[PDB]
Amino acid sequence: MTEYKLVVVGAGGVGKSALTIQLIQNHFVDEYDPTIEDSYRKQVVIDGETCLLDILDTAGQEEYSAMRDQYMRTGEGFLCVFAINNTKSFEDIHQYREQIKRVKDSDDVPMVLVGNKCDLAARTVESRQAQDLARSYGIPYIETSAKTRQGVEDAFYTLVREIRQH
């Protein structure tokens, strides 16, 4: 089985940990406990092939912003997460994109753009706006809810597919 190093990045509170824990444990975390750096493992069959996913769950709080290079070096693919009810988190996306490209010195890094908390009615970021950005990056856009599981497997396993064909 092939091992895949996935990294989940994005502004504080967008739901990076909730997405990851929903994927790993099928459980929604209601608490907001700011992450420093957590690691998870998941054996899963994707398109008929057994994969071992290593998922790095990173810090969104700005106070940790000087410590990103080290995990960007190791990651093979990145979930770039914002919350669809948080415009600033969407604006923070391009900063993650650029840093990842710089660190790995590549314009061809496997990535998926994720618009989380799609269970909430009070949207402030329109799907079209996020889709436009995704197309300019050449990557898919998937809306998710760590709460209901909507899109969660799709987001993570799409990222695996991109690494696989990289």
Binding site: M1, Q22, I24, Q25, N26, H27, F28, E31, D33, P34, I36, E37, D38, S39, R41, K42, Q43, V44, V45, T50, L56, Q61, E63, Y64, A66, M67, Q70, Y71, R73, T74, T148, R149
Partner: protein
Amino acid sequence: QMRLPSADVYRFAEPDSEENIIFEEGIPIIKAGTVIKLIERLTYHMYADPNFVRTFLTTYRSFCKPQELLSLIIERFEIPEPEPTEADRIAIENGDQPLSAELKRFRKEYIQPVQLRVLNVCRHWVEHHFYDFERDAYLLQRMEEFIGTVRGKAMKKWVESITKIIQRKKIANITFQSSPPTVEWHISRPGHIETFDLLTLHPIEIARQLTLLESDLYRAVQPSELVGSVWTKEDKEINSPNLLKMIRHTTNLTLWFEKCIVETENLEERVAVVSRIIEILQVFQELNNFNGVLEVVSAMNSSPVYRLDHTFEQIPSRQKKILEEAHELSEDHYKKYLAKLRSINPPCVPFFGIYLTNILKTEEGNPEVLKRHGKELINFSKRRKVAEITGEIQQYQNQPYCLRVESDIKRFFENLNPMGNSMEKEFTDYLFNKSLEIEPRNPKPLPRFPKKYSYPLKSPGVRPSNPR
């Protein structure tokens, strides 16, 4: 490269050398080191190593006491700031604001990352290894005190968070998208617990309810029950209660299968019993319940059962194949089992026995320390090997089964007690004597026995049904 505090005022600034750290031959992997060096690398300024954090927190008690670990990471956290440089001095002497470039860099690239990583050790410790604090209230007070008195805005969000996490842990829901299949019934109807038995419950539902039970038992085992080989030692009931509950379930179910078989004296009925057990095995295989699979395989290979040639002869060929395929999982030191486990799509229920043997042998077969240049270094590669096994165990504990609990069937299997009040030797001797009775050794002739079951023996089969 940043200058460091003097090693005389801050021990973790000692240079790496072969006398305090040895690496294996994109971050380094540590073969051995002093506790100081292990903790330095556990909280390194250059990179995070979350898997090292898990490995260390799972295994450290073999070389460091919990109270000393806390003292050492608090020591690690308390990093002196450098004095102003010549350029800073000259600015200050002229009434100007110093640039403090070196100070700012050391704060940003050494102090804040190391302190954050110390707090991450604290966070993981509390969240995933809370038993140290359950077993030592004073250790918990020290942790609460340390976290509760960290000052400064850089660490504030995490300190306030960890304080809340600790308080939660002191006083202490699944989503699937798809719904679980409908519970299946055979001769015994819902609520009629008195009639529940091997042949009267639906074989599909027997396998499902045992899989839920065995998955819960599997998922309940903590690394604390495993490190230091404590399940094999005198205090095993104290230190490894969840593991032992799990194993005793497996043992009891195996004995129950054997008992159901040899206490069915009529050959035709006994064949029906064995066939039904093989159908249950088939559903275990479908559910990736490998513990369940081996429960059955162990029963069929047991002395009282294996020798039942007349029974085996009448087992349908398609079931002989199922059983043989299951048996081959265990052949050649579980070669096919290990490959299958690593290929399926979870949820599954691993067989725990292999993990136990590999943990025990890893601990027994490797030294606690490596001696180098007159110094004793902690052999960390040994601990990493143990943590790789506990890590694999934990990985299969995450995924829950999408199956509905049937409370009465669950209770029936929780309360199974095939040995009754008998001791093990007495009971297993009884099983073998029953075996000899129902199918005597050659050249004694095969007797006939009256039937014992008043209900139909025909199986409902193991393909699930689905009404609207």
